[PDB]
Amino acid sequence: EVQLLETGGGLVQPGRSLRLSCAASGFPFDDYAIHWVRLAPGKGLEWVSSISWDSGSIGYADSVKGRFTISRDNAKNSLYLQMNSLRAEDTALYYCAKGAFPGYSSGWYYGLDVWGQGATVTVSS
Amino acid sequence: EVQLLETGGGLVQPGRSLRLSCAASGFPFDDYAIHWVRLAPGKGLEWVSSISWDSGSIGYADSVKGRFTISRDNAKNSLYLQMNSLRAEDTALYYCAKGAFPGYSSGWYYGLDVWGQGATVTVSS
Amino acid sequence: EVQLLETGGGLVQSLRLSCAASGFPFDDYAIHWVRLAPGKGLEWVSSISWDSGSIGYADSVKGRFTISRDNAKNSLYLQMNSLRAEDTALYYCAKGAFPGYSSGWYYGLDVWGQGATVTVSS
Amino acid sequence: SVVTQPPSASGSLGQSVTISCTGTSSDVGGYNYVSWYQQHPGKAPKLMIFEVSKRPSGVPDRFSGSKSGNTASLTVSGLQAEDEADYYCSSYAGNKGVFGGGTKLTVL
Amino acid sequence: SVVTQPPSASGSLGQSVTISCTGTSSDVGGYNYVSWYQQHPGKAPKLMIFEVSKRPSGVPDRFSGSKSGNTASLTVSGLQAEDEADYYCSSYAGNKGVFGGGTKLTVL
Amino acid sequence: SVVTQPPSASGSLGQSVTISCTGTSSDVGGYNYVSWYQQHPGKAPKLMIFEVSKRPSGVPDRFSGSKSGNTASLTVSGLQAEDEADYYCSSYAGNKGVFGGGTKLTVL
Amino acid sequence: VYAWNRKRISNCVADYSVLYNSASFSTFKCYGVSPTKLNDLCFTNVYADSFVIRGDEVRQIAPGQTGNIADYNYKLPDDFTGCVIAWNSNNLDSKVGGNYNYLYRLFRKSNLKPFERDISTEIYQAGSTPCNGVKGFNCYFPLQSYGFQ
């Protein structure tokens, strides 16, 4: 079956860094664009970042622009999110989600059909 | 009361990175320029970096120029210092200090009246 | 005596390797990484000059690995990101006979470390 | 940006409830690419609607989508116990996506 | 740059001690913006003097500042037990500041 | 690139065995910088030959190097029990080096 | 200095030679033009900005300078084309009991633009709470007196 699993969560102080990983299987990770979406406690879903199949198209939310760094390793079928200079409002549940079709914006066109279980990230002093 | 609290300290190997944060409260962080000053063991105070209220004016000491990166988030009332490629002589106690008046060089004009408790940084192999 | 010791190995589905040096002037010599894949032979990975002014990678890890060094700590590093199954090998830290960059190819690599194992499997 | 969504919705067993999703002319009212997601507690979201009104395989006919101006709506007829969950809307916004605030659906 | 400061100073209870702070024509001798700071062990520094000789609110009259050429001085009359601490001078240097080396003050 | 080496070699005790190392005109046949390495099981490689035919200190006269066109050879006369090991050749290739495939030497 | 006077001079023959040899000036620095060449130059207008400052603040009156006087009282452009003359006025602007009539701006949110005059006396808000025209904690009067003796 299709499957995504996020790793790298934990508690980290405001200003420090943390890197998240997403292991993929069950589908051709070589061709699909993948995205990060977080769920803040008390708030709703919030899109974090996106990266195309060849990393030729990359986008960030304004709240994490110049703060997070998305990347991928198609050989390892893994997606990464380097979070530096974390803030209290970055405390959320980060999801790894693939689109219905391999295009970059196609996950917005036809929805995000597959989601991972998520990895918790806490940013408190 | 006015208050500054530094976070992000610890031990890190020579060449690695470390990010410091300074949480502010009790005064209008939107308008004041903030600075970093470190205290090396056995030595005295040493100014590290400075950043104006809108990040329009930024300065570094020659020992950390092109090495540290200062920044701020006025919405979170937080100051940051990204330290990359750390050296043994970077081992010090890093202070977050605001000026008497909101100007950039005003902390040098009228002194630095408010200081944080500091965060320890050790750079050894 | 001259001595090199590699650390940072393990199993991974990124990974950073370190090489601690002693017994010789690490400030002046260029150091290299060479791996030994199970069933295959030696394969040169990367090289870096004394001041990092000259850096080279094999085509199989070009744009994938990042070599660096800290002369104050007498340490060499190799940041391996996006690892593949064929990256499973025994990574060696080796210095050249003379401090030049290509001198390890000119006169051979006389000192080798014990190596650190790296496994890339799901 | 921000996509306005009522914090809570309610409907009795077998009745219907509509969950609105209000954006601007650059997202909800600028394209026909509104999605809806269901999230049960402790589980990952599930795509329920894409392209305003299209249902993926595995979604019952009880869920239906519509849009009118800057406001997209999700109607759930014949409400059932398993429909109690959180519902978020999504919309395209020009190489970027944006979610709604979310609505807790209570089946009374 | 470097601002020269004697490593240690001393004075008896009730006496006076002057702590010099020597710079160049581009910092201490180039502006009238010399500051003095007191630091007790394990606690953050405290501003004692600004603009060479001005005292903030909360600093006793026993601390007084002066400058002469490239040398700024901090005089502490009527020395007291709580005055034992470290003292650093600061100076403006053109969009940059610089501290002195520091002086440990022992009240004998 | 690829430097061709036979997977296995053999020779009786006291006899001789030559291990070939074949490259191209841009490595083995382009420079006189061919090296040879010995590796016993579980131990780091040991430099045996550099510059095609030069021996470092500590290498017996039994090991000798030669080159002819794109083919470099390592000859081990008076074969001994301790000579059983793996042997790799190295060559310069223009700011880059390249190793041979390797040859297991069995002393029969 | 915060209310530095300005006089516009136009439609007249300027006498620079006699002007510069009348009194004894403790500071005379020109930028972008020599004192002796002004006798040959014509200009659309001339501006004479007059004020009083501290001696140690005289250095702040020049292109590319920073400080309280430069930032909040009187600012010159980096490409300033003109002359600065300064002379001690202790016998004129000093009183036995102290001459507090001369004032200077101490607190200001932002630095002045070149040739900008600010005469505002609004209470300066140094904190989050508004002052509402009441000076107190974190609410300071923007002007400070020299009190020359």
Numbering used by the authors:
A (entry chain F), B (entry chain H): 1 to 125
C (entry chain D): 1 to 13, 17 to 125
D (entry chain G), E (entry chain L), F (entry chain E): 2 to 109
G (entry chain B): 347 to 495
What does the paper say about this structure?
S is the major surface glycoprotein on the SARS-CoV-2 virion and is involved in viral attachment to target cells via the interaction of cell-surface-expressed angiotensin-converting enzyme 2 (ACE2) with the receptor binding site, at the tip of the receptor binding domain (RBD), in the S1 fragment of S (Lan et al., 2020). Following attachment, cleavage of S releases S1, allowing a major conformational change in S2, exposing a hydrophobic loop that executes fusion of viral and host cell membranes, releasing the viral genome to initiate viral replication (Walls et al., 2017). In-depth structure-and-function analyses of 27 potent RBD-binding mAbs isolated from vaccinated volunteers following breakthrough Omicron-BA.1 infection reveals that they are focused in two main clusters within the RBD, with potent right-shoulder antibodies showing increased prevalence. In summary, we have presented a structure-function analysis of potent human antibodies induced by Omicron BA.1 breakthrough infection in SARS-CoV-2 vaccinated individuals.
The first antibody cluster includes the IGHV3-53 and IGHV3-66 type antibodies and is toward the back of the neck/left shoulder, extending up to the top of the left shoulder. This region corresponds to the major epitope for potent neutralizers in our early pandemic antibody panel. We have determined structures for five mAbs within the neck/left shoulder cluster: Omi-2, -9, -12, −25, and −42. Some broadly neutralize all VoC, while others are sensitive to the mutations at residue 417 and 484 found in Beta and Gamma (explained for Omi-25 in Figure S4A). (I) cryo-EM maps for complexes of Omi-2, -38 and −42 with Beta S (shown in gray), RBD in cyan and Fab in purple.
